Every structure is written in C-alpha cells, then in structure tokens.
C-alpha cells in the first residue's frame, strides 16, 4: 500500500491565467440587414443562441481588471475594423482647395459668431477639362483662415488627406460577443459586490461574453451595463490620482440629444463615380444643438455617487465637482455619435456641485464638427457625411469617468472633475467580469495501482 | 446540487469538488478541447493552435503506457517526498487547483521517469516476444 | 494628505561605511519611491515599488520596509554617495535626508 | 534614449507669466503622461501637475488651480511620430515662485507606476525680481 | 570558447540544502554535452558529483551521493544548478561546474570552496 | 563520446551509429516531428502541412497492429531475398540511411502486407468473439 | 537648359520612408517541425561533395 504508484488522468479541471487571441460573435439579426450597412457582420461569426453559461461552485479566483487582456484586443480590434472599413470609401484629397467663405445668411448679432460658414470653391467635374464653381457649409472647428478678402482652407489639409465615410456603413453600435477559442474558457466574475480586483467567491465559467455594444464616449460613458443593486466605483488605486474613476451606476440616466437645425445634403461629383456629400440649405431657423436631462434624477445620482464615494474618503468629507481643466476638445467636452453624425457637449451644467457632510431639465450646449480625428493617429482623418432631417437620440447614460485633482496641503474638500483620457477605460467598464483561462489536461497523482505485465 | 445524487453536470463543474469526486468526470473537459479577410488569419491560427495543443498531449500520452486510455496505472514508483500528505485525504480534501501547486516544483522529472519506463517496457517485450 | 518625514535628517558618516535612512508614512499600506540628488545636479531614481532598483542602480541600495516604516540600506558608502536622499508617496515628498562627511 | 530637453533659465518680473517648454524625444509621445515638479529652496520638492499628450489631459495641484496652464504640442507627420512638446505657463508671479522647475516622465516597466519619474529634465532656473 | 562560472555560497551550516548554479557563454547549453557537477575536497583527489544533459537523458549520478544531488538545467537562462540536501561538515569542497562532450570535460568552471562549517 | 556508456544524446544523434544502437533512442524522433501580414500564411502552412504529416504517419500505423506501440511485431513474414544479408550482422553493421538504401526497391508491397495482416487478425478475431 | 528626371518614362518612383532604415540586422533561418538542417561543419570544403564532418 505504501509502495505508491504514480497515474496520469487526463482531462483533469485545471486551468491557469493566459493571454491567447479572442473570438468574434454577432448576433444573427444585424446579420438580416443586407450589405453591412454596419461594419463586420461578415468579419464575424454568427452567435450561436443561450449559449452554456454553466456555473461553478467553491471556486475563488483572482481577477484583477486593471492588468487585464482582451481590453487591449478589443481595443484593437476596433481600431483595424474602423481602419478597415474605410478603404473602400473615397478619399477627399482634390478638396484640398481655397475656400471663399463668408457668414451663413442669418441675423447675426456681432457678440454672438456665426457657427456655421458658407464656403464657394472651385471643383473638378467627372470631366478633367472643365470645372465648376460650388458652394457648402461648414463648421467653425472645421475651416482656417489662409492669409480685403477673407479665404479660408480645411484643418486637415496641411496634416493629412481624409477620407469622407461613406453613407452605407453607419457607427451605430451592435452587440459584440466576445468568445473564447477551443481550449479556452471564459471567467465570468458573478459577484453583486466586486471592485474589480481581488477573489471573486463567485464565479462562474462560459465559453461567450454577454452583448458588448462599442459606444465611443469620452466622458459619461453610455448604454454600458449597470450595477445590480448599488453604485460601483471602481479605480486601480483610489488614493492614486493619476489613475481614472471608473463610476457605474443603478439606475441609467435618461439623456435626450438633438441638433434641431435641418439639413439638406447635396451631392458634389469629385471625379468619375466620386460623390462628395456636402450641405445645402438650412431649411428653417438656425439653432444649437443641445442635450438633455433630468434634473432631479441627475441630482439623486449625484447624491447617490457622493453616499458611495464617502466611504473610501471618510464620513465627515466635502465633496464637490468641477468641469474639465482644459485640454484638445473632446476631452474637455463629452463626445458622442448620434444617428451617424458627431456630438461634442458641454458639461459644465452637471458638475457644479458641493456636497456637505450632513420638473425641469438641465441643458447643455453642444458643438457638432464634421471631420473627426479620433484615437488620434499621425495621418488619418474621417470626414463624415451631413445627415437629412432634424436628429435627435434617446440614450441610457451608465456610468461616469472621474479623476481626483491632485489635493494636498490640508484640505478638507476632495473635488472630482470628468476626464475621458484613453477609449479603453470604456471597455474596461464592460470587461471586469471576464477572464480569460487556458484549460491544462493530464494532471498526474499518486495512487495504489500498478499496471501489470 | 441539481446535480447531486447523480454527481455530474457541464464541463468544468467537477473543477470546485475535490479531486476524488472530480476523477469520475473526465470525458467532457478532455472532448471541449478539440472542437469548440484578415480576420480568417485569426480564426485559423486559433484552429490550429487548438489542434497543435491537443496532438502535443495526446503524443505525450502516446509515448506513456496509454494511447487513449484516459486513466493509467503505470509501473514508476511515488517518492513521498513530493506529495509528503496523508493519500485518502488528498481525494476528500484537495482541489485539482490546489494539487496542482502542490506539485509544480515536482513536474518534468516525472515525464521523463514515464519514459524510461514505458521504453524499458517495450524493450522488456521485445525480449520476451523474441526468446518465444 | 500623507505627511511624510524624514527622521535621520542629517546624517554623519564616513565612506566605506554602511548607512540606514528611515522614512515614516501618515497612510499605511502604499509603495515608496526613494530618490539621490547630488549637489548642484539633477535628481536620479534609485527605488521604485519599495524594493525594486532603476537602471544603473547598483545593488549595494536595498530598500525594504513595510506598512507605515521604509528603510533604504546603503552599505559600502561611496564619496559620491553623499547626497540628498527623498521619499516619495504619489505626491507628497520628505523634506530630504542629508548625508554628510565625516 | 529618452531625451527630456527644457528651455534656458529665466528672470522675470512679479505679477507676469512665464512659459517653459519641454521638449521629448526618443519615445512614442502619445502613450506617457509628463508631470511638472518644482524645487524651491529650503522648501523641498512641490508637484504641479501631470499632462496625457494623447488627448492632453491635464491635471494641477490644489493650491496652484487658476495660475498655470500646461499645454502641448504633438508631432504630425508620419515620418518623425516620435517627438513632442510640453508646455508650462506659470501665471501670476510671486518672489517666492523663485524656484527650479522640471518636467519628467516615468518609468517604463511593468510593476512602475506614474510618479515614479525615470527621466528628468535638466530644470530651468525661473527668478522673480 | 565556452565559459562557465560558478555562483552560490560557499559557507553554509550542515544539515541543509545546498545549492549552487553555473552559468554558461560561449556556447549553448542544448549541445552534445554533459553540463556536470565535480567536486574535489581540499587537499584530496576529484570526486565526481554528476551530471545533466542538454539532451533528453535521465540525470545520472554518482550513488556515493546517497540521492540527496539533483542537478536541474535551465535551458532559457543557460544554466545548470546542482543540489546538495542534507550537508555535513566533511562535505566541504571545490565544486565544479564542466561540460563533457567529444573531448572530455574541456571547459570548467573555475571552481569555487564551499566550506561547510556549523 | 560524451553519451558514451548511456547512449543517448539529442534528436538526430544516434543517425551516425548502427542501427541496433540506434532502436533504444527513438522518442526524440518521434518528438521533434510535431512541435518544433503574408508571412502567417507561410507559417500556417508549415505548421498545417507538419501536423497533415504527422497525421498521415499515425494513420499509417493505426492501421497497422499498433496504434502507439512505437515498435511493432507483427505477423506478416520476412522475404529473406529482400534483405540477403546476415541478420545480426545488420544491426552491428549498417546505418540507418544504408538499410533505406538498400529496401527502397521493396517498399508499398509490405504496407499491402500489413493491411491484409491487420484485417485478417481483426476478422479472427470477430468470429473469436462472436462464437463465444 | 532644362532637364528631368530619368525614371519620369518608364516607371513611376517611390521615396523610401526615412524610419525605415536598410541597415542589415541578422538573419537566421529555421527550418519547421519535419526538417532538419544540416551544416557542414569541415574546415577544408570547397562547397561541392561529401562533407566528412
Ligand atoms: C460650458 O458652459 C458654461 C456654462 O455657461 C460656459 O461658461 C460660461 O462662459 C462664458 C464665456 O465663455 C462666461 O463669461 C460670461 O460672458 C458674458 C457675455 O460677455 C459679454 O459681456 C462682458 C461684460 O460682462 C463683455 O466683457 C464681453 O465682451 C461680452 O460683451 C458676461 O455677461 C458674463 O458676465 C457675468 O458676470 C458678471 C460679473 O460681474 C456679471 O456682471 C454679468 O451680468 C454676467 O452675469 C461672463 O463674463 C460665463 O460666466 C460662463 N458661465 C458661468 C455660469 O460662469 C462655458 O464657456 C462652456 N464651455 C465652453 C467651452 O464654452
Ligand atoms: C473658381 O474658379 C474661378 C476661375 O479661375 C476663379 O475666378 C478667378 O479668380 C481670380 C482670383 O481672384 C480672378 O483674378 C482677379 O480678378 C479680379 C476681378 O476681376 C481682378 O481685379 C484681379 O486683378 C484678378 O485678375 C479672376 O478674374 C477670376 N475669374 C473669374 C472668371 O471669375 C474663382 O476665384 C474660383 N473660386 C470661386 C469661389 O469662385
Ligand atoms: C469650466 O468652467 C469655468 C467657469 O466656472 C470656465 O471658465 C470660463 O472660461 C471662459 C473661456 O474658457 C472665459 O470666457 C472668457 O470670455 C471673454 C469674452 O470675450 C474672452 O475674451 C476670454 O478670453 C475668455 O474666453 C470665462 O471668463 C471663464 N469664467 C470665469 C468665471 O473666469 C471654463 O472655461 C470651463 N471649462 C470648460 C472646458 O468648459
Ligand atoms: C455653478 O452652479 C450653479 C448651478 O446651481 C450656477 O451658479 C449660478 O451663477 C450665476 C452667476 O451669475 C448666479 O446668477 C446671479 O447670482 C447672484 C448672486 O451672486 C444673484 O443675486 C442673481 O440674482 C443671479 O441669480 C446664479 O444665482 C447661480 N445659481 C445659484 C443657484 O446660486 C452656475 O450655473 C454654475 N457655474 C457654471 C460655470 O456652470
Ligand atoms: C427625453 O425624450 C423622451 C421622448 O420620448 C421623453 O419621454 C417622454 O416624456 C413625456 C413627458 O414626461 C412622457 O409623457 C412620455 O410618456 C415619455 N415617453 C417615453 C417613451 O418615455 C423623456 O421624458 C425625455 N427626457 C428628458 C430628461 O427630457
Ligand atoms: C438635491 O436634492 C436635495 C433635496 O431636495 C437638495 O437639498 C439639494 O440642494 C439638491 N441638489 C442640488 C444641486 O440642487
Ligand atoms: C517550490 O520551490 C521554490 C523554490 O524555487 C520554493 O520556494 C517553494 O517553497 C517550493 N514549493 C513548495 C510547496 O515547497
Ligand atoms: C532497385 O531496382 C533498380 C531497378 O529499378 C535496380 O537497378 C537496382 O539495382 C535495385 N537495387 C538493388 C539494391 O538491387
């Protein structure tokens, strides 16, 4: 009996952390839309319906959100897919050209500049004989002054050409499940209360992710998955300040959003088969876009945030909000894309507030530009196709990105100020309950068998 | 739970129980190992990633007393040093996880024992079928 | 805040020597940065993470400690060793341990 | 090599701004934050404020909010991606904001946080008179 | 142009694990080679510890050493580590690191006195 | 030379000795057969074209009497004007490569060979198993 | 006097990217997993016949 053996089984439950590649699902109705009028459900396999998510019972892993993988790949995942759905489009280097512009027609007060500018240009026609004298209108964040007369040129044509989207693909998100390959598994960290790194007492194994939409958003991070019952804060290190916030809350905030202003896009031929798509008339009065919310919803929110982030601040704690210190734009402003066209809002009317020990609606201004250079690279630039019709978009704001401003000398108060940073501080609000684990088989162990001859 | 009584469920459920209790469910955690335009570069390093895993261990079962036995007794002796615990309680006491930090600084020497005596094995049949 | 403190202050040895300059916390359970900066000249790392050395640190640094108390051991004392040495907690720094000739 | 160059030193009056500059080369200069510190005499160090030059992203201290201002400038073109500049404007001039001022960035492993500043400028000397 | 040097103590107190490591340059350690373990106490003749291959053989060594000597190689940082558990005073000394090959034991470690002492 | 007296060595290194020294090192062989934006496709092809190899040899044997003995008596007979030499004289006398030199005239009439041998004893002992 | 280029009739011309550099870092070649290479190692080898060694 004490002259123990040694046996192999194979197909032992054992695994250890990895990091291996990942693998795309769609669901099959964005797969019903024909031609991919979003990106890549041709690019990625159908998901296969209520896929096995078999729990697992007294089993403590670690997980730890902050040096986690597949955030990284999802990041740039995103970044090939919107690389890769742009060389089919066209490339807008012959409008490279001198712009007359002048102000839009309107009654325009002298305070008050105009937003948008009316620009005549010449243009190449289909033919290479003749060109043609048309006009458009920009934005302000998207035309410069070349240097009486008064002639302006585009921001990007002394950086990089752009490539104008085209009309077919949109960037409305649809549902990214994430799937492990064979010989992988996925850990799904199911626990109510979990700040993201540490054991995990309840977890659970399952070979796909949930339905991780790619919003882009800077600050006020959107339609991401909410908490269960309380509201998560979560950082790396909460008394780092370097470090972001990462603030998911219970009940999603209703935000309204709308550029009212009327638009009537109109088809320019660049070339032969080349359509450029710029804006004709502004049929009806010229407005702001702007977003909505809640009042009091937002105030309860706000004192919801504030009850939860007193606790890792202590009790008797002032705490109160600031606007963005400055910046590029869109990390001042929070950033969006409704209905296809880009959102940069104000924020200013939702963190001015302290908070102390112890009907209506807030709007707030947006700036719309029509080229985009997000992730920013060294030669890319998107322009993006103005859109018919007043547009607006309903959406469920989620969760927050805060930062701690750099406190010291001996102040009660602790401000927070919203700060978007890198994209990938979205995804990890929709990452940390996944893990990904490689299975090892043939485990081997001592036993009183011995094989025989 | 749903599975008491009748102790088995999905693959990796056995992977929280001991490893007594474990050893009854292998087949499943050893068949979801196998089955399951640049992007279809992805797609098929990950396929044959998978398929290049699993030949590696069944060739190093292979060259083991067991081709697909999937549970060997072999002839190579246990020092007690390794495990150096009490051995009914390891299987009503020990997680594979556990087991298996256990015994990570013991590992690669006892591949090498298996082979020494699988091929002494097989030389010790070739004795015994040729002197017949 | 953390407050930092230096407690040796100034310290008076000679070279060949070993050397120990303690830090306190006002905050447990953080890592520690220590910092040389010679006379007149730009400050260098020496200890991230309280134990780990940078590049072109030689091995004689040790830093160790724990909690709310770190020590940075400096044994075989060069002349060009005799320096300001900081702490660093995120933001906050010691006011400098000096070490001096004797 | 991670080459952190700053502007000459500086006298200037009390009451105006002042601008450094820091100039980065030898790194990727849109993925490391820079932080600003400042030594005064017999006051040791004091930091300012950290930028992230990918967005430019900046962060000041609690007792110098509404006096400086730290911008940068990126490199665009895709044959030198590498280089980059920092700036700092130190607004509303003191006689005790006399100091030496660096701009630094971390270190570049795995266990190195963010304040853990590898590479240092050489400092700029500012005097107010 | 093989080199190998030798690191580890060589003061320990008896009755514990030794262990020294040897690191290799000038060639690879996956070599037609026995990266080996010899030993010689002062004043005396050589007494071969063992050994370990770059190949796939089963380390075999001396059984004067009571199976108490694992010699481990470590092939991503070219190295090759004798063990010694259990030592006695009367196992002071020179330990040496060395490569058999087609020639025998052509580049040694320099060798270095492991001094056991209570 | 250095693998003297235990004669092993690494992969390849028994292919100078006779090949009686050379039938106790033949794990190694047998392992260094499987492990080890346009460029993927060369690599994806290398590794898929030694994984069908590897397949096609393990096919090759399963077939045969044995799936993963690694040496195989088996019952087909020995034409004695194939190899026309002395028998011990071949395995104290000639390489590896020398003996495939020799037999490369009589090849893929012993595979026949094996195949009717293997199915003739799966057939015996079909109606072994079928009368009992 | 004027001139032009000489490529500007028969091809079209690429600039290199002055990143890439066409200093020669060292090469090595492995074979896959079913081959070996093998290097003659002889000191006296005129690059054609039966390498002893
Ligand atoms: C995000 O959203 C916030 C919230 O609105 C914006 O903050 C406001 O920004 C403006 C300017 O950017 C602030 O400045 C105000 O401008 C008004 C118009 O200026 C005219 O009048 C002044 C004289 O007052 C002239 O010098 C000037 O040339 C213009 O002719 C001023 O009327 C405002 O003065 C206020 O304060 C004085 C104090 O004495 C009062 O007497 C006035 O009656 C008046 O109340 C002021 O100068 C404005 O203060 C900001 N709002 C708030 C609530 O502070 C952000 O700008 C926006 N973000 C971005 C990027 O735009
Ligand atoms: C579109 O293309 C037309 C055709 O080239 C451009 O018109 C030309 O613009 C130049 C530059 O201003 C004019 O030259 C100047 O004209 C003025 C007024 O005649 C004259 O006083 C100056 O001495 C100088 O000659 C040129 O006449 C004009 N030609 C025509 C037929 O209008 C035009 O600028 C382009 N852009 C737009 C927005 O139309
Ligand atoms: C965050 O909120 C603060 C207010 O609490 C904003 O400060 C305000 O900033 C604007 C411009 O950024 C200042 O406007 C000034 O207007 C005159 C009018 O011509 C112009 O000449 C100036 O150059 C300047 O643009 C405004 O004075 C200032 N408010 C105060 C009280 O000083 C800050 O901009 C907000 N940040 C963001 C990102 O929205
Ligand atoms: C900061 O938060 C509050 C939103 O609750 C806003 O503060 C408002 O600031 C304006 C400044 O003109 C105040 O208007 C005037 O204030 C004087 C008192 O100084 C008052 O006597 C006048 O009748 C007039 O209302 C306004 O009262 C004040 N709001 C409150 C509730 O006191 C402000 O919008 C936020 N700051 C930013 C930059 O958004
Ligand atoms: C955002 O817009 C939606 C538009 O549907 C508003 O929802 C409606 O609000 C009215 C006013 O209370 C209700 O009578 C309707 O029943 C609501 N419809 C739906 C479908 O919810 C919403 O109130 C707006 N929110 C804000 C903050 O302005
Ligand atoms: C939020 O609501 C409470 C309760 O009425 C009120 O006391 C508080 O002032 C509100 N906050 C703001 C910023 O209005
Ligand atoms: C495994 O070996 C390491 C030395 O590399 C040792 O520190 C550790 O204690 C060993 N594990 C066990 C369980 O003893
Ligand atoms: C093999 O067959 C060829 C004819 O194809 C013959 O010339 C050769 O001699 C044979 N080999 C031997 C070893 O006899």
């Known amino acids: 009996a004490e002259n123990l053996w040694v046996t192999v089984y194979y197909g032992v439950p054992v695994w250890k952390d990895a990091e291996t590649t990942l693998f795309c699902a769609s669901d099959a109705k964005a797969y019903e839309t024909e031609k991919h009028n979003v990106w890549a459900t041709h690019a990625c396999v159908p998901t296969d319906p209520n896929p096995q998510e078999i729990h697992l019972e007294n089993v403590t892993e670690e997980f730890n959100m902050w040096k986690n993988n597949m955030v990284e790949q999802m990041h740039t995942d995103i970044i090939s897919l919107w690389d890769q759905s742009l060389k089919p489009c066209v490339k807008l280097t012959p409008l490279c050209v001198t712009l007359q512009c002048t102000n839009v027609t309107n009654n325009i007060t002298d305070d008050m500049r105009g937003e948008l500018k009316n620009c005549s240009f010449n243009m190449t026609t289909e033919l290479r004989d003749k060109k043609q004298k048309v006009y458009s209108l920009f934005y302000r964040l998207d035309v410069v002054q070349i240097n009486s007369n008064k002639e302006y040129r585009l921001i990007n044509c002394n950086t990089s050409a752009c490539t104008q989207a085209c009309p077919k693909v949109s960037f409305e998100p649809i549902p990214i499940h994430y799937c492990a390959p064979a010989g992988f598994a996925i850990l799904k960290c199911k626990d109510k209360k979990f700040n993201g790194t540490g054991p995990c007492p309840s977890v659970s194994t399952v070979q796909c992710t949930h339905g991780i939409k790619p919003v882009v958003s800077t600050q006020l991070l959107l339609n991401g998955s909410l908490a269960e019952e309380e509201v998560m804060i979560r950082s790396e290190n909460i008394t780092n300040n370097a470090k972001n916030i990462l603030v998911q809350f219970n009940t999603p905030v209703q935000i309204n959003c709308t550029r009212p202003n009327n638009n009537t896009r109109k088809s320019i031929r660049i070339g032969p088969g080349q359509a450029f798509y710029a804006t004709g008339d502004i049929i009806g009065d010229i407005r702001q876009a702007h977003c909505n919310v809640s009042k009091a919803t937002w105030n309860e929110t706000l004192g919801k945030v504030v009850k939860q982030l007193r606790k890792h601040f202590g009790n008797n704690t002032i705490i109160r909000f600031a606007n963005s210190s400055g910046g590029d734009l869109e990390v001042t402003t929070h950033s969006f894309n409704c209905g296809g066209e880009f959102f940069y809002c104000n924020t200013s009317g939702l963190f001015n507030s302290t908070w102390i020990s112890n009907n209506d609606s807030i709007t707030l201004p947006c700036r719309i530009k029509q080229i985009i250079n997000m992730w920013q690279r060294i030669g890319q630039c998107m322009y993006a196709p103005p859109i018919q019709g007043v547009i607006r978009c309903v959406s469920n704001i989620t969760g927050l990105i805060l930062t701690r401003d750099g406190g010291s000398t001996n102040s009660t108060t602790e401000t927070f100020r919203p700060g978007g940073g890198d994209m990938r501080d979205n995804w990890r609000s929709e990452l940390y309950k996944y893990k990904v684990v490689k299975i090892e088989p043939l485990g081997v162990a001592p036993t009183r068998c011995k094989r025989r001859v | 739970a749903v599975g008491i009584g009748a102790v088995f469920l999905g693959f990796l459920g056995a992977a929280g129980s001991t490893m007594g209790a474990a050893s009854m469910t292998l087949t499943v955690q050893a068949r979801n190992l196998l089955s399951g335009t640049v992007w279809g570069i992805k797609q098929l390093q990950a396929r044959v990633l998978a398929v290049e895993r699993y030949l590696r261990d069944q060739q190093l079962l292979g060259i083991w007393g067991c081709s697909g036995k999937l549970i060997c007794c072999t002839n190579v002796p246990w020092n007690s040093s390794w495990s150096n615990r009490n051995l009914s309680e390891i299987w009503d006491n020990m997680t594979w996880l556990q087991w298996d930090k256990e015994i990570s600084n013991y590992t690669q020497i006892i591949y090498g024992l298996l082979e020494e005596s699988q091929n002494q094995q097989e030389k010790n049949e070739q004795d015994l079928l040729a002197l017949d | 805040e953390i407050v930092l403190t230096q407690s040796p202050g100034i310290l008076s040895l000679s070279p060949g020597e070993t050397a120990t300059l303690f830090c306190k916390a006002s905050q447990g359970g953080n890592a520690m940065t220590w910092y040389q900066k010679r006379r007149g000249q730009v400050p260098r790392l020496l200890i991230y993470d309280t134990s780990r050395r940078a590049s072109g640190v030689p091995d004689r640094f040790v830093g160790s400690g724990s909690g709310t108390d770190f020590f940075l051991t400096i044994n075989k004392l060069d002349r060009e060793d005799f320096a300001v040495y900081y702490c660093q907690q995120f933001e906050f720094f010691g006011l400098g341990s000096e070490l001096e000739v004797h | 090599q991670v080459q952190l160059v700053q502007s000459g030193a500086v006298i200037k009056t009390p009451g105006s701004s002042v601008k450094i500059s820091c100039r980065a080369s030898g790194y990727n200069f849109r993925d490391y934050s820079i932080h600003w510190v400042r030594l005064i005499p017999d006051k040791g160090f004091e930091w300012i404020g950290w930028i992230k030059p990918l967005w430019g992203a900046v962060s000041y201290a609690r007792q110098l909010q509404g006096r400086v201002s730290m911008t940068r400038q990126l490199s665009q073109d895709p044959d030198d991606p590498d280089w980059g500049v920092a700036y700092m404007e130190f607004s509303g001039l003191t006689p005790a904001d006399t100091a030496e001022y660096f701009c630094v960035r971390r270190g570049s492993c795995d266990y190195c946080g963010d304040f853990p500043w590898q590479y240092w400028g050489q400092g700029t000397v500012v005097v107010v008179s | 142009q093989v080199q190998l040097v030798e690191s580890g103590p060589g003061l320990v107190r008896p009755s514990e694990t030794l262990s020294l490591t040897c690191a290799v340059s000038?060639?690879?350690?996956?070599?037609?080679?026995?990266w080996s373990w010899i030993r010689q106490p002062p004043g005396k003749g050589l007494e071969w510890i063992g050994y370990?291959?770059?190949?796939?053989?089963?380390?075999n060594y001396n059984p004067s050493l009571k199976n108490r000597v694992i010699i481990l190689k470590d092939t991503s940082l070219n190295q090759f580590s004798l063990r010694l558990t259990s030592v006695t005073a009367a196992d002071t000394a020179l330990y040496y690191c060395?490569?058999?090959?087609?020639?025998?034991?052509?580049?040694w470690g320099p060798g270095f006195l492991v001094t056991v002492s209570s | 030379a250095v693998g003297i007296g235990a004669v092993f060595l690494g992969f390849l290194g028994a292919a100078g000795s006779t090949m009686g020294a050379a039938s106790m090192t033949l794990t190694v062989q047998a392992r260094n057969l499987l492990s080890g934006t346009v460029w993927g496709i060369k690599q994806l092809q290398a590794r898929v074209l030694a994984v069908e190899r590897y397949l096609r040899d393990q096919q090759l044997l399963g077939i045969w009497g044995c799936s993963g003995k690694l040496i195989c008596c088996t019952n087909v007979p020995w034409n004695s004007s194939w190899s026309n030499r002395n028998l011990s004289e071949i395995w104290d006398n000639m390489t590896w490569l020398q003996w495939d030199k020799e037999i490369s005239n009589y090849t893929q009439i012993i595979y026949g060979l094996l195949e009717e041998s293997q199915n003739q004893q799966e057939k015996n002992e079909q109606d072994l198993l079928a009368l009992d | 006097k004027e001139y032009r280029l000489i490529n500007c009739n028969t091809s079209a011309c690429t600039q290199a990217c002055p990143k890439v550099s066409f200093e020669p870092i060292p090469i090595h070649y492995c074979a896959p997993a079913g081959f070996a290479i093998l290097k003659c190692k002889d000191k006296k080898f005129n690059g054609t016949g039966p390498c002893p060694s």
């Open positions: 060395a490569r058999e090959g087609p020639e025998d034991f052509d580049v």
């Open positions: 370990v291959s770059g190949g796939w053989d089963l380390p």
């Open positions: 000038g060639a690879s350690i996956r070599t037609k080679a026995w």
